[model samples]
Target: MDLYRQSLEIISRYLREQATGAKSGATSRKALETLRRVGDGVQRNHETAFQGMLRKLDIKNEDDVKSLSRVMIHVFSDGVTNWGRIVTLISFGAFVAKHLKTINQESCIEPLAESITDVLVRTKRDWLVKQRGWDGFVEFFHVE
Candidate 1:
């Protein structure tokens, strides 16, 4: 299986959940920002959706996704170009499920069905801070 793909799928799902609003937490907040940045890059936003699921994950965007992706790439991709895919393949089940839990997209406002939102948010937040800067990024996460 492709861990990279699993990771991206986890991240993407987390971002997607954050958009809809069944999740929240340190992960969700930071995920929102990362979601903001990436979604901004991709043009998507729905923080109001995944509020419920986020809280369950205990994910505090303590800054870790950017480096993690690289690490995941190095470990999974072995210096390959398609890092996202690599993460996906290598990370699934616990690897994937541990992060962006499945939710009823039909009811973005509902509580999470599975529970993996933290993985996506925290991951994206880490990357965003790495790309930007902890100073403003902290503010983005509303941290003091």
Candidate 2:
């Protein structure tokens, strides 16, 4: 299967399994937030501020990619550590990379997604990162 299709399957399978688990309200709230953004493609419900940002930043190129990345890192990386969130983050990154390709630009989405999913399947468990762990995740993904 193609990378995008395969990535979707992995994400769908993971979400379905997670839905079956009992909820004790103990899962990280940050996980919930990340999952929503990861799955949410375009934010249509926003009234002004978010849409305004998108208008200025979503330019379909490396410049926009860097812009969005800066925002995401600041918004999502605070005290967050769920392994599932890491996978989800990479998934969205892959999708964005696909989008960037449409605009004739370079994107690391597939390579990064494939690498993470490969390790994710092998790992077979969700582990929390240490505080401010995004630095480690970004560094690892940046290397390849």
Candidate 3:
């Protein structure tokens, strides 16, 4: 099975399960490949769909800001533990914060469904940066 297709299938099913208030949390080995493509695709080209979804959900400035702030704060808190993690969190937080602004517009409603998504993406990216090794950031800042 094509992993990309598989992952999309899984995400779709998960969303469906969520619609009925179910706890869908299954993963396949192909999940990684599917994730690489889907994750990057959303972060890169399909960001608007997420924002639109949030808009549909009526996400507002207060809600978006609060959630983003929490994620940013968590990233900040995690930063002190390691320069690498800090740097990764900082970078991801910056990106997520910028994207999150769309739903924070004065006209938004329902607090935007993407609020949770933005936080999750930002958190995951921070984790990815760790896998790639944070030595570069450590060497630059923590080298006293």
Candidate 4:
């Protein structure tokens, strides 16, 4: 069974539900909110890194999704596998999703989410499964 694919689908679905409307179920919404919080934390503490990635990705429109995916694949592959890095990947994707919305390209969110899942599944499946997949993510970011 492809646990990575299944786990990533939850995130991808969350992104679509968020873009289409705030219609995600409570559990998924909470999970995504956790991701957003993590993204915010990263943006605050690593502003330079965050901004640097944005500049490096150079994603100004929907057409840039493919290029962004390519860079993500490269980045994911080069990095040593770790939960922190995995969290950062999803957090960065969340930031990118926000940028897409800001530019009125909300429709691109699905493809962006897909690209993120593709990269993660392709490059980090074993690591993800080792961590128990999305369940691990929720546990890691769980808050009172």
Clashing pairs in 4: none
Error of 4 at 17 (Å): 7.3
Best of the candidates, TM-score:
4
Candidate with better lDDT, 3 vs 4? 4
Name the better of 1 and 3 by lDDT.
Answer: 3
- Candidate 1 ranges with C-alpha deviation above 4 Å: 1-24, 42-76, 80-144
Against the reference, the lDDT scores of all candidates come to 0.35, 0.43, 0.38, 0.70
**Models ranked on lDDT:** 4, 2, 3, 1
Query: Candidate 3 on 2-70: residue-level lDDT in tens?
Result: 322332343333333323334313333333333333344344564565456445434344654455545
> What lDDT is obtained when candidate 4 is compared to the true structure?
0.70
Write the residue-wise lDDT of candidate 4 on 1-144 in tens digits: 456456466667656654554542454556666666675587568767877878877777667877786677877789478767876787677667767787788887877887788887878777776877666777787864
Highest lDDT, which number? 4
Better of 1 and 2 by lDDT: 2
Residue by residue across 1-144, what tens digits does model 1's lDDT show? 232233344345654454444542354355335534443332223333323323543333323222234334333434432323322322221222234334312332112212223333334545533544323333543432
**Alpha-carbon deviation at 104 in model 4, angstroms:** 2.3
Say which prediction, candidate 3 or candidate 4, comes out ahead on TM-score: 4
Q: Rate residue 52 of model 2 by lDDT.
A: 60
Cα error of candidate 4 at position 14, Å: 5.0
- Candidates sorted on TM-score, descending: 4, 2, 3, 1
Candidate 1: residue 59 lDDT (0-100): 39
What's the count of clashing pairs in each model shown? 49, 0, 12, 0
